[PDB]
């Protein structure tokens, strides 16, 4: 928003630094579509993409790989994007936000992918800029969620092909929310599996997985609340750039985000219940082990005491050669064992 | 400290003069950096402590398991040995079979039976 770019320490002034971790790949896809035709174009040359700024027909530019700060700088300079917006584009450790300017709207969103057989939740920040007839979109790496919008434009399906760029911004945001729902389904399946495992067999892997799931759910909450806020901001007023015809769609997406937030809060509560269940189950197992150990200890320590009796080398044995002394002490053996077994059965151990 | 620097570059009284405002803005951005780093470190350290609880609390169970198994195996065997060996030593004088190997075989059978009975429900 401000003209002056932020001044970091240890960096030469006026520098822009990519913040994330992905540097493998870079590619620019352009999908220019009109009422009667479309075009597709995948290159790594920024110059062939720049003239699409002033095209009357809507344009979709997808620049994947923002570690190339030079490409981001060139696109921002040509499109008139302020330097601070570019800094926010390159900053990854940033919660979702929406910013309104005179000639464009800048939206920061976040994707998510869940990995099977290795439960880790990963995030990737995508930025969208709606300028004039174009929708710039910046991505960290190959792999996104907007394939359905691509196919809809390719096959002239729906009302997307006959509308302006704001409907394209809608399509992308709704696809992102849809894959949020997909992620929630994956997480719910994992929660069911974890529930069965913890309730059936308490192990260290169980608490490891459950705590990782808890951290992931907290991260999801922290990501999903500002996204609801920014969709609210997109459908409340949005004066300059977004037409009044497209606001019911943004309202629909806002409702979807409300549902997602409710679901993630339910998941948090369920996971807390799972942690309590694990603690109770482990306490019960330790109690059972103590029951067993105490049973044998209580039925054998007095036995060792009576074995120590008649085990002392004293001159005067009362039953020094009494007949059936071993049978009578074994009878006392059996009687004591039986009576302690009966007594412990009274308390239902 | 961030609030102080904000006051310095925003209120800008005539004593501070206009030419030095950008330098105070730079220092404000540095304070922003510091605060963000402190908050991130706070989150990391708070996360670290829960890992310690996740670690040590998963040791008492194993220690208790090994103590339970060793005690429940070696106390009854100690009793059997104590019965078979005393200073009273009023026992059948004639050896019959190999008495000591038979006693050892009984010891091993009892130990194996106790081991098999354990971990049936995976309590160990």
């Amino acid at each position, epitope marked *: 928003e401000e003209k002056r770019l932020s001044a*970091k320490k*240890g960096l030469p*002034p006026g*520098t822009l630094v990519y913040t994330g971790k992905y540097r493998e790949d870079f590619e620019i896809e352009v999908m220019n579509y009109s009422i009667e035709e479309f075009r597709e174009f995948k290159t790594t040359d920024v110059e062939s993409v720049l003239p699409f700024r002033d095209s009357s027909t809507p344009t979709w530019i997808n620049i994947t790989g923002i570690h190339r*700060t*030079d490409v981001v700088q060139r696109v921002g300079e040509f499109f008139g994007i302020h330097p601070l917006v570019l800094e926010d584009i390159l900053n990854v450790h940033q919660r979702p936000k929406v910013e309104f300017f005179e000639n464009y709207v800048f939206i920061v969103l976040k994707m998510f992918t869940y990995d099977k057989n290795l439960h880790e939740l990963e995030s990737e920040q995508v930025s969208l800029i709606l300028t004039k007839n174009c929708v710039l979109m910046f991505q960290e790496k190959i792999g996104d969620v907007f394939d359905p919008v691509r196919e809809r434009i390719r096959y002239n399906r729906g009302i997307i092909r006959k509308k302006r760029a704001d409907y394209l911004l809608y399509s992308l945001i709704d696809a992102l929310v849809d894959d949020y729902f997909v992620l929630l389904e994956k997480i719910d399946d994992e929660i069911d599996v974890l529930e069965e495992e913890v309730l059936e067999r308490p192990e260290k892997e169980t608490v490891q997985r459950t705590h990782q799931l808890k951290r992931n759910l907290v991260e999801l909450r922290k990501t999903i609340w500002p996204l609801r806020e920014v969709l609210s901001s997109l459908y409340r007023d949005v004066p300059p750039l977004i037409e009044k015809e497209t606001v019911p769609y943004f309202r629909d997406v806002y409702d979807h985000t409300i549902q997602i937030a409710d679901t993630v809060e339910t998941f948090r509560d369920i996971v807390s219940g799972l942690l309590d269940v694990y603690l109770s189950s482990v306490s019960n197992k330790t109690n059972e082990v103590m029951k067993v150990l105490t049973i044998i200890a209580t039925i054998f320590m007095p036995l060792t005491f009576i074995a120590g009796i008649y085990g002392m080398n004293f001159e005067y044995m009362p039953e020094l050669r009494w007949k059936w002394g071993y049978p009578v002490v074994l009878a006392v053996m059996g009687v004591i064992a039986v009576i302690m077994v009966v007594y412990f059965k009274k308390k239902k151990w | 400290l961030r609030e102080v620097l904000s006051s310095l570059y925003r209120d800008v009284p005539p004593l501070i003069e206009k030419e030095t405002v950008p330098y105070f803005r730079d220092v404000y951005d540095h304070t922003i950096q510091i605060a*963000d780093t402190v908050e991130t470190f706070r989150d990391i350290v708070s996360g670290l402590l829960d890992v310690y609880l996740s670690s040590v609390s998963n040791k008492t169970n194993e220690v208790m398991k090994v103590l339970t198994i060793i005690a429940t195996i070696f106390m009854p065997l100690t009793f059997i040995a104590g019965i078979y060996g005393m200073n009273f030593e009023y026992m059948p004088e004639l050896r019959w079979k190999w008495g000591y190997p038979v006693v050892l075989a009984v010891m091993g059978v009892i130990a194996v039976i106790m081991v098999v009975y354990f971990k049936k429900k995976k309590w160990l």
Partner: antibody
Amino acid sequence: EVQLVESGGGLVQPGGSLRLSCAASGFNVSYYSIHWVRQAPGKGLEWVASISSSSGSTSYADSVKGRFTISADTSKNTAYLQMNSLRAEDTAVYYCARSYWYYIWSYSYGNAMDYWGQGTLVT
Amino acid sequence: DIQMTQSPSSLSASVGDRVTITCRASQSVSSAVAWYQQKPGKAPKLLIYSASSLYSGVPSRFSGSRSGTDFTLTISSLQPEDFATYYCQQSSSSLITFGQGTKVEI
């Protein structure tokens, strides 16, 4: 696609002065930082200078501070290193490198040299 | 000034065995440590940056670690083509400083 080519060295009298030119192809000198790294004959790598042509920020090692002056021309896409009062110890294979900044924490940043030039010899 | 102590000065090992090269810094450099490979008569090649991140286009056998002020470079499954000199480079300050080097030989 990215190449860095150095030239302008090979022989000079002690106390002499000369300029080494690094030519950038495939990238813009004003969107990155250009470093000079020298390797003495049978020795290890040593950092000399670095310029960020966007703002003209210059940083010099204590060994060659004041003697060496680094500069960059944006239109020419070339970065120079004009040595002065050059000694006998200064002989090395002077490399030209391109670096990008990365992120560790909000307060700490690091840079790593990804593309290197072939280097030139100075005696 | 920040100095990086790269020990040992030179190491020898066979092919197919794990080799670790360590490096130590005189003071607190957060993580701005990079590893370079220089074959004889050639320009260096970056392998590890941020002391733990493997540079793109570099085989996955190479790896790095940081333990406070100690930094190590490991080669899990050594290959015949992994014979060169390796340097640890701090970059916390604007005065970049390299390490002495560690030549790997047969």
